[PDB]
C-alpha cells in the first residue's frame, strides 16, 4: 500500500513531581513523540496527569492586596475605583452598596472596534488567537474625549493609543507571453523511362519496356504556447494600536490560570497554559485588511503531420512476328501511401484568492474569481474600519505579564515559563510530521498532523492529482539536539521533504546549520 496510517506515539510518563506546597497537588506528563497522521489512531488526551497530596509543607499566602478586593473576582482595585459608575471588578463588588455612584463617563461612548480581539493572546508559532489575557474593558477612570469622525470612544486603561492612521497600497502586475512556431515542407519526385526496339529482317521482332516512378513526402509541425500571470494585492491600513508598556490589568481567566501554575517546574502545566492562552501578547499592531489575487495560465498546443507516397510501374511487351505470331504483355506495379497526424492541446490554470477583514458579503464577493469593481473595493474598505484584521504585530512573550504585583514567586514562574516556552517551540513545530506527498504542507494540529493540499491536489496526503509531475519544495527535518558544550550547535538535514524530486522546487530555507555559545 502507498499510504500507511501512523498512529500517535507519546512518551512514557515523567516522574511524579514533589507535592506543590500551594496547590497541594502533584503532576506528571508525557511528550508527544509522534503525531498521528494519515488517519492514524489518535492518542488519548492524557499527556497530563494530576494527583492530590497531603500538605507536607505550607507555602506563601496569596500576594497582599492593598486596595479593595472584588468579592467574586478578588481583583485588587484602587479605592478611588469604587462608586465610580464603572465595573472595574468584572463584578459589581466595587459598586455594590455604594451610597452614591458618581458617573464620570456620562456621555455615550463606544469601545474601539475589535479592541477586545487584541486583548487575546496569540500562539506565535501558529499566529492564532487564544484565550483572553488582558482586560480591555477596565477603564480605571479615563474618560478623556477620544473621537473618530463624529463617533466618540472610551479608551481602555491598558491601551496607550488607538488611532485611525489610514493608508492604502494597491499593486497590480499582469504579464502575458505568447510564442508560436510553424514548420512545413512539400517535396515531390517523378521519373519516367522508355526503351523499345522494333526491327524488320523474313523476320520481325519488337520489344517495349515502360517505367514510371513517383515519390512524394510532406512534413508539418506546429507549436503554440500562451502564458498569463496576474498578481493583484490591496494592503489597507485603518488604525494603529499600541498597548501601554506597564502596569497592565490582566484578564481574570488568565490571572487565575497563572495562579494555579505549579511552583516546581513541570512542563505539562505551562504547556496547557500556552494551549489555552498562547505564548505572546500584542503590544503594537496595525489593523486593516488584505486582498490578494494570483492567476496562472499555461496554454500549450502542438500539431505534427506527415505524408509519404511511393509509386512504381513496370510493363514490358516483346512481340516476334514472321503465319506465326507470339506476344506477351507483362506489367506490374506497387502503390504505397502513409498519412500520420498527431495533435495535443494542454491547458493548465490555477487561481488563488485571499481576503482578510470586512463584512462577509464583501469578503465573499471578493472571493469570487473575477477581479472586483472599484465600488465593491470601496465598500470592503469601508467595512474594514469596523472589523479589521491585524496586519502587523509586535509581540512580547506572555511571561512578561507575570509580575510580582500580581503573583507570588514571580521570578520562579517567569523562569518556568521561559523553560516551558522553549520546550513548547520544539514540541509544536511542524518539523515533526511525516512529509506530505503532492507538495502538501503538514500543519501540526495538536496531537495530529494535517496536510494542507495545494490547489489541484486532494486526499489525506495530497496523493490525488491529475498533474503527472509538479515541483516539490524542500522541507526541513527537525533541527538536531544541542551539540555538547564546546560551543553550541544544531543542524538541519533539509531532508523531511526532498527538495529535488519531480522537477524539485525551491531548496529549503537557510540556515542548514545553527551554532551558538553554550
Amino acid at each position: 500500500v502507498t499510504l500507511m496510517p501512523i498512529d500517535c506515539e507519546l512518551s512514557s510518563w515523567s516522574s511524579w513531581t514533589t507535592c506543590d506546597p500551594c496547590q497541594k497537588k502533584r503532576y506528571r506528563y508525557a511528550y508527544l513523540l509522534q503525531p498521528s497522521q494519515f488517519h492514524g489512531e489518535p492518542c488519548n488526551f492524557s499527556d497530563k496527569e494530576v494527583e492530590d497530596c497531603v500538605t507536607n509543607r505550607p507555602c506563601r499566602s496569596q500576594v497582599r492586596c492593598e486596595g479593595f478586593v472584588c468579592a467574586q473576582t478578588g481583583r485588587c482595585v484602587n479605592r478611588r475605583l469604587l462608586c465610580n459608575g464603572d465595573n472595574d471588578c468584572g463584578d459589581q463588588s466595587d459598586e455594590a452598596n455604594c451610597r452614591r455612584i458618581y458617573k464620570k463617563c456620562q456621555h455615550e461612548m463606544d469601545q474601539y472596534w475589535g479592541i477586545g480581539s487584541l486583548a487575546s493572546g496569540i500562539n506565535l508559532f501558529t499566529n492564532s488567537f487564544e484565550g483572553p489575557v488582558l482586560d480591555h474593558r477596565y477603564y480605571a477612570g479615563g474618560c478623556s474625549p477620544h473621537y473618530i469622525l463624529n463617533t466618540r470612544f472610551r479608551k481602555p486603561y491598558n491601551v496607550e493609543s488607538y488611532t485611525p492612521q489610514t493608508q492604502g497600497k494597491y499593486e497590480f502586475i499582469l504579464k502575458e507571453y505568447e510564442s508560436y512556431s510553424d514548420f512545413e515542407r512539400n517535396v515531390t519526385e517523378k521519373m519516367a523511362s522508355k526503351s523499345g526496339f522494333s526491327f524488320g529482317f523474313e523476320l520481325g521482332i519488337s520489344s517495349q519496356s515502360d517505367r514510371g516512378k513517383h515519390y512524394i513526402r510532406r512534413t508539418k509541425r506546429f507549436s503554440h504556447t500562451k502564458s498569463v500571470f496576474l498578481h493583484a494585492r490591496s494592503d489597507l491600513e485603518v488604525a494603529h494600536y499600541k498597548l501601554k508598556p506597564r502596569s497592565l490589568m490582566l484578564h481574570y481567566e488568565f490571572l487565575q490560570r497563572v495562579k494555579r501554575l505549579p511552583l516546581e517546574y513541570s512542563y505539562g502545566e505551562y504547556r496547557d497554559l500556552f494551549r489555552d492562552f498562547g505564548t505572546h501578547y500584542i503590544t503594537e499592531a496595525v489593523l486593516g485588511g488584505i486582498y490578494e489575487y494570483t492567476l496562472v495560465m499555461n496554454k500549450e498546443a502542438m500539431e505534427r503531420g506527415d505524408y509519404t507516397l511511393n509509386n512504381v510501374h513496370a510493363c514490358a511487351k516483346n512481340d516476334f512476328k514472321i503465319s506465326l505470331g507470339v506476344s506477351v504483355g507483362k506489367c506490374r506495379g506497387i502503390l504505397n501511401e502513409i498519412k500520420d497526424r498527431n495533435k495535443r492541446d494542454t491547458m493548465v490554470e490555477d487561481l488563488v484568492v485571499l481576503v482578510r477583514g470586512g463584512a462577509s458579503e464583501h469578503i465573499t464577493t471578493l472571493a469570487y474569481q473575477e477581479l472586483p469593481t472599484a465600488d465593491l473595493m470601496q465598500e470592503w474598505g469601508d467595512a474594514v474600519q469596523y472589523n479589521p484584521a491585524i496586519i502587523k504585530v509586535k509581540v512580547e512573550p506572555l511571561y512578561e505579564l507575570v509580575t510580582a504585583t500580581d503573583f507570588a514567586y514571580s521570578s520562579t514562574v517567569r523562569q518556568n515559563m521561559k523553560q516551558a516556552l522553549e520546550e513548547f517551540q520544539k514540541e509544536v513545530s511542524s518539523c515533526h510530521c511525516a512529509p506530505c506527498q503532492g507538495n502538501g504542507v503538514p500543519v501540526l494540529k495538536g496531537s495530529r498532523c494535517d496536510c494542507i493540499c495545494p490547489v489541484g491536489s486532494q486526499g489525506l496526503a495530497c496523493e490525488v492529482s491529475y498533474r503527472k509531475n509538479t515541483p516539490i519544495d524542500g522541507k526541513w527535518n527537525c533541527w538536531s539536539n544541542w551539540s555538547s558544550c564546546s560551543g553550541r550547535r544544531k543542524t538541519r538535514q533539509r531532508q523531511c521533504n526532498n527538495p529535488p524530486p519531480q522537477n524539485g522546487g525551491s531548496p529549503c530555507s537557510g540556515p542548514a546549520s545553527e551554532t551558538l555559545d553554550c
Binding site: 477586545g116 490554470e349 469578503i363
Partner: protein, 513 residues
C-alpha cells in the same frame, strides 16, 4: 456481480434485568445487534435497549450528592452559592432564583445582550459513526454570573429615518453575551478561494494503403492485391475544482470546569459505577461518541466538474482478384471489417454549506458574482460550523467540575471501544460502485452515487467502471496466548471491483493481552 440477498435484522436474547436502581425505580436490559437487515429484509422491531419501572425496596441512600453547594431540586446541578439569587436562572428548576428576597443579589446587568447566535451547536455532542448531532453536552445557556461579551464586527445594519432622510446603521446586536463554556469566540472575517483547471485533448490518425498488381497476358492472367488500414484515436479530459471557504468566527471550549448540560448531568449520575454495557451504550447513543472543543464558523462552497470523452474508429479492407481468359474465368476474395465506438462521461457536484436555503440553493445551481455576493450576505445571519475538533465523549469527565469519576470514565472508555465496533458502518455489507454504507440504529443502507441503483448500488447503467475496495470489519480479537493479541481484516468488502484503489489501512491489528 449479481445482487446480494436480503438478510433479516437479528438481535441476541435479552440480557438479564439490572437490579432496580434505588434512586430511579428502573430496571434496564440490553440486547446486542447480531445482524442488521443489510440489503433489505425484515428490520427488527425490537430495540437494542429496554427499561422498566421497578420499586427498589431500598432508598436512594446516595441522594445527598452535594452539601454546602446549592443543589437544585429538579436536577443534581450544584451551584456556587453566589449564583443563588444572582438574577440568572442557573438551572431548569429555577430554584436558585426562587424566593429571592434580596433583588440586589443579582450578579450583574448583563441581560440586554443576547447569547451568540449559533453557539448552541458547539454544545451538541457528535456521533462519528453517523456524523449526526447528539444531545447537548455543554450547557449552551449558562453564564456563571459572568458578563463576558463579544464584539460582533458585522453589527452594521442600514436604517432609513424617513422623517430625517438620515441613512444610518442601527447599533443593535453590536455585542453578544458569551456563554461561560466558550473560552473564546473570535469574530474574524477570512476568505480563501482555490481553483484548478486542466484540459488534455489528443487526437491521432493513421492511414496505410498497399496495392500489388501483376498482369501477364499473351491466354490472359492478371492478379491484383490491395491492403488498406485506417485507425482513429481521440481522448478529451477536463477537470476543474473550486473551493471557496469563508470564515466568520473562531470559538474554543473551556477545558476547565465544563458545566455539563443538565440532561447530560442527570443521565451521567444515573450510570452505575459498575460496568454495564447497555447503560453506557445508551449514554453514548444519546450524547454521542464525541464532544467538540475547537470551532470555526463559516460558509463553504465546493464545485467539481470532470468530463472524459474518447472516440476510436477503425476500418480494414483487403482484396485479391485473379483472372484467366482465353472462355474466361474471374475470381477474387478477401477480408473487410468496419467498427466505430464512442463514449462520453460527465458529472458535476456542487454543494454549499452556509447561511440561507434560498441563496445556498441558488449558488449550488449558479456560480456568479450575484450568487457569491448574496450568499455572502446570507452568511451574516446563518453561519455554520465549518470545521471542528473533537475528543472522545469520555474525556469531558476528566474536565468536569464533578471530579475524578474514574470508574465511570473507564467504563465509558470500554463501552465506547465496543460500541465503535458494534454499530460500525463496516458491518453493513459491500456497497458496490463507491456506494457508502450507513448503519442507522439497527438498519443498513447503501447511499448510491448517481451512476448506481439498487439496494447495494450493484446494478449500473454502464457495464464496468473503476470502483474502489473497502475494508471488511475487523475479525474478533484472537485469544492472547502470549501477552499479545491479534485482530485481522481484509480489503474485500468489496474487493476493488475494476482495479480501483485498494483500501489503504492496516491489514492486521494487534493488541495488549
Amino acid at each position: 456481480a449479481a445482487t446480494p440477498a436480503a438478510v433479516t435484522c437479528q438481535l441476541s436474547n435479552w440480557s438479564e434485568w439490572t437490579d432496580c436502581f434505588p434512586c430511579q425505580d428502573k430496571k434496564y436490559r440490553h440486547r446486542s445487534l447480531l445482524q442488521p437487515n443489510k440489503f433489505g429484509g425484515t428490520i427488527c422491531s425490537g430495540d437494542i435497549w429496554d427499561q422498566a419501572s421497578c420499586s427498589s425496596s431500598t432508598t436512594c441512600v446516595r441522594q445527598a450528592q452535594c452539601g454546602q453547594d446549592f443543589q437544585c431540586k429538579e436536577t443534581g446541578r450544584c451551584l456556587k452559592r453566589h449564583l443563588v439569587c444572582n438574577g440568572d436562572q442557573d438551572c431548569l428548576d429555577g430554584s436558585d432564583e426562587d424566593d429571592c428576597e434580596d433583588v440586589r443579589a443579582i450578579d450583574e446587568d448583563c441581560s440586554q445582550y443576547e447569547p451568540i447566535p449559533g453557539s448552541q451547536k458547539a454544545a451538541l455532542g457528535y456521533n462519528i459513526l453517523t456524523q449526526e448531532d447528539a444531545q447537548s453536552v455543554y450547557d449552551a445557556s449558562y453564564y456563571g454570573g459572568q458578563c463576558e461579551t463579544v464584539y460582533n464586527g458585522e453589527w452594521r445594519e442600514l436604517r432609513y429615518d424617513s422623517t430625517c432622510e438620515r441613512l444610518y446603521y442601527g447599533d443593535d446586536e453590536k455585542y453578544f453575551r458569551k456563554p461561560y463554556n466558550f473560552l473564546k469566540y473570535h469574530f474574524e472575517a477570512l476568505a480563501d478561494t482555490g481553483i484548478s483547471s486542466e484540459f488534455y485533448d489528443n487526437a491521432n490518425d493513421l492511414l496505410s494503403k498497399v496495392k500489388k498488381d501483376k498482369s501477364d497476358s499473351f491466354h490472359s492472367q492478371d492478379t491484383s492485391f490491395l491492403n488498406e488500414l485506417n485507425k482513429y484515436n481521440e481522448k478529451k479530459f477536463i477537470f476543474t475544482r473550486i473551493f471557496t471557504k469563508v470564515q466568520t468566527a473562531h470559538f474554543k471550549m473551556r477545558k476547565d470546569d465544563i458545566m455539563l448540560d443538565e440532561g447530560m448531568l442527570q443521565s451521567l449520575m444515573e450510570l452505575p459505577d459498575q460496568y454495564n454495557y447497555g447503560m453506557y451504550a445508551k449514554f453514548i447513543n444519546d450524547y454521542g461518541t464525541h464532544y467538540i472543543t475547537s470551532g470555526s464558523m463559516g460558509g463553504i462552497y465546493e464545485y467539481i466538474l470532470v468530463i472524459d470523452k474518447a472516440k476510436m474508429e477503425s476500418l480494414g479492407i483487403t482484396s485479391r482478384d485473379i483472372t484467366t481468359c482465353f472462355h474466361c474465368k474471374k475470381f477474387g476474395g478477401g477480408k473487410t471489417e468496419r467498427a466505430r465506438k464512442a463514449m462520453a462521461v460527465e458529472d458535476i457536484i456542487s454543494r454549499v454549506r452556509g447561511g440561507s436555503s434560498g441563496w445556498s440553493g441558488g449558488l449550488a445551481q449558479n456560480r456568479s458574482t450575484i450568487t457569491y455576493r448574496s450568499w455572502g450576505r446570507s452568511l451574516k445571519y446563518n453561519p455554520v460550523v465549518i470545521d471542528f475538533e473533537m475528543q472522545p465523549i469520555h474525556e469531558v469527565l476528566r474536565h468536569t467540575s464533578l471530579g475524578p469519576l474514574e470508574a465511570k470514565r473507564q467504563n465509558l472508555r470500554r463501552a465506547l471501544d465496543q460500541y465503535l465496533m458494534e454499530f460500525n458502518a463496516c458491518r453493513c455489507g459491500p456497497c458496490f460502485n463507491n456506494g457508502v454504507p450507513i448503519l442507522e440504529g439497527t438498519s443498513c443502507r447503501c447511499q448510491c452515487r448517481l451512476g448506481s441503483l439498487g439496494a447495494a448500488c450493484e446494478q449500473t447503467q454502464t457495464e464496468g467502471a473503476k470502483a474502489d475496495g473497502s475494508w471488511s470489519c475487523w475479525s474478533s480479537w484472537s485469544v492472547c496466548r502470549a501477552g499479545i493479541q491479534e485482530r485481522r481484516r481484509e480489503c474485500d468488502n468489496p474487493a476493488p471491483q475494476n482495479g480501483g484503489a485498494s483500501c489503504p489501512g492496516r491489514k492486521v491489528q494487534t493488541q495488549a493481552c
